[PDB]
Assembly symmetry: D3
Homo-oligomer: 182 residues x 6
């Protein structure tokens, strides 16, 4: 939020080709990357060094956002995109939803969409139709990551509620696209 | 091709400082990178996750394009740039031509220019004057890659015709620059 | 085979704790490693630089052998071990069989066992009970690799017959352990 | 522990040149390595694939053991060795102690020595005289790792007691060398 | 400098939030990256392949520039940013100054600012208040790098004068921001 | 040299199959590896952390030794092995000589053999018949490395004399094999 006195790239990427089923994700943090959190400055069209993760824990899945969306929290809709090889930071991928990881943090709701590329793009993930198809070990791994990664950030905490499905994820997209347009 | 109803960064990079001899290449896929094909969205100025290579085969040389060019196929002029270390995705390099790899695929002509940086930039490749100087093992390796990488993409095939020289490569550049301007 | 005139580590590792169901695999080539083939010198207890893969193609799965085995071909029983992260060259892993990839090359039979670590060691692969559970894309990828990797080795060729199951893989182990003892 | 019926490399490396002040550490898990736990088979002189870390968390410091030692737990004395670049698995380094990380797990005492190479070997760590010189962020990071890494291993838990100094670490070495000789 | 006849992204990033104390650095060359020098084309908003370092020596610290600055030499103000993990090329980081490395080369003054991220962003570097806190081995390493990296570039040389402090670094920023505005 | 009072793997690897033309090299430091010098403990059959290179400079070519050799300096014959991808530390490669890099250091002669794998093993280096075929940029790079890498080691220095050929390299091997046998 910029104040009245002062206020006197990425933003041109569409949210999706066929929302909410077919959406675009701009990658911020590749899976397994060294433990540095980058957050897109949507104005500037650049990735910003946001935090050196105090726990040194790495994202177990790629992390990114859907451009032209605004979730309640002030963030765009944030997305975890599962792939067999980490994606390049700052790249864009066409995606479909598997579901939602429901969480809350010290500041409020903190839900993350779970997504994969389209089947034609990534045949390796074609077998994942919904959140329930994601391997148990990987869902547990993703949950534990969110619960623990900010553990050494003063003031901060994260609690996971559980998972929800495709309908829940489409609602987040729908709402986020609506919010961004006012 | 965008339809009439709907149609109602990279594009500002010049094709070259002194065409067709001295041209610019924007890198899409670094040599030896994990087997994910990225293709520049010239409009958006971003690299797009295009395909997870079904064979898992990696590019043996850097892959990129000359901005502000349009080959017959709808692609910009595509270029293989040989370097002693892989180049950064999304970077640009001033280049000179060694020749052409002539190929056709299920969709039509599929020729790729072979290039190296300028000698001042990359003294390691100064000894490469023409395609014939490229080591045999590496030309065979590049040919085999193109013949096999799409082997597990349904509908797709690639056939290599052989190699051509600097004059042939300059013609591709000349023509591609001409086409892009109409 | 050493001649009479001249003949005048790894060998102390058991084939398995409970053969043929539970066997040990010493890793030679990690999945996704740079395209250099290493083969254990069982006498010397060292990995030997065997070949720079002419195609530059990388192993899509870890490659190793079961110590104290002798297949017909003169090799130990060779094994492909599937893991979510590449294993360290020269390490050993306790393994269970999924099946067999049946192949022949210019020199004769060329069958490879397909294996995973034990479930307690690697919960990520616990869902793989047999060869049929291995993702299609990965089996196709493994087949294509074996068909193509030696393509630029003069005199050499490899043909894949298809896959077989756990019973077939246990027979290879049983026989290989028997052969090694005479 | 091997039973009477059945019982009918690394072991030749000395514990240390000048114990307990100057000791040797054989590296098992490099700092920042992919999340696979290796444990030396002291008999066989090989690193064994022990566990795919369920949390996917990586060691923030190198992990190894002092050969020819036996701590109460059945393990050799285990050591965390801090270096500016990860060490090679299976290598050996001459080391000096900074202190001890005191912990207990479901099975009993679980103390880890904290060490660095000698100053001549590693001038980068010469400024670390005792555990207290280790950066706070890194000690917190190491503590959090041990508390959380086994979080998804059924039956397992780890509690950290706190840190102790050089005298405490020398006692662990002294005792461990004594135990190993009976 | 563009000539009159011809003259007929990054530039929109502010020099700093609170100059000269709080400034932004756009990263060009990550610490420890393969030995390829990239220099931002401030016009085009792209990283340009500038040189394959003839010595093959790698930057021991991240290298970047402060946008909207013009030092005497024609370059923006150039900055070395120290971090515990290399930063992504083309990313931006909010930074504070430690001091200056004073140098001259064949072409004139060649001073480099030394910086770290803000403490909240990077708690690992919070202990570095001034150039004097930077480990001796690392300052010697940085000096030796600048003295030697261009050793095999014909015509080129670099001499290091020594280090200066925070006041000197703020002057470079102040002046560089002033120059860029005319 | 061990004193009388105290004196009261690798060593079993032959120097070569057909000396001095065909010899074996055990790799200690891979090309381009992080700047940590490892030296084989020939007794123990392990790689030892020898030095964290004060300059942080990396070996531009693989570094290893010929087992069962003793050069004047007390070292085995040391060898630089050129390959298109770095070799695994602790592996062994069959090699042929290109020549010698003649050098002296504070302690005496300090000559290094220059070698490549056999042509069948590494077709990529088949074009290198003698030292003169090695690219100029790479010989300059290797020379500069040896001149500078120990620059920040107190007491130490290295001077390069120049290069010699295959006959000179065979003499070093011949002599080194002779010395090792007394």
């Amino acid at each position: 939020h910029m104040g009245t006195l002062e206020a006197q790239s990425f933003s041109n990427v569409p949210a999706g080709k066929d929302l909410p089923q077919d959406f675009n994700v701009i990658i911020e943090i590749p899976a397994q990357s060294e433990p540095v959190k980058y957050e897109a400055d949507k104005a500037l069209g650049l990735l910003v060094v946001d935090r050196f993760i105090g726990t040194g824990m790495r994202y177990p899945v790629n992390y990114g956002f859907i451009p032209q969306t605004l979730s309640g929290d002030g963030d765009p809709v944030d997305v975890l995109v599962i792939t067999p090889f980490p994606l390049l930071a700052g790249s864009v991928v066409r995606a479909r939803a598997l579901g939602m990881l429901k969480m809350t943090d010290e500041s409020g709701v903190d839900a993350k969409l779970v997504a994969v590329p389209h089947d034609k793009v990534c045949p390796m993930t074609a077998n994942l139709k919904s959140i329930d198809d994601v391997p148990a070990y990987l869902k547990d791994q993703i949950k534990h990551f969110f619960e623990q990664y900010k553990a050494l950030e003063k003031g901060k905490w994260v609690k996971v509620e559980g998972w929800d499905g495709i309908d829940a994820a489409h609602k987040e997209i729908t709402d986020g696209v609506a919010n961004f347009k006012k």
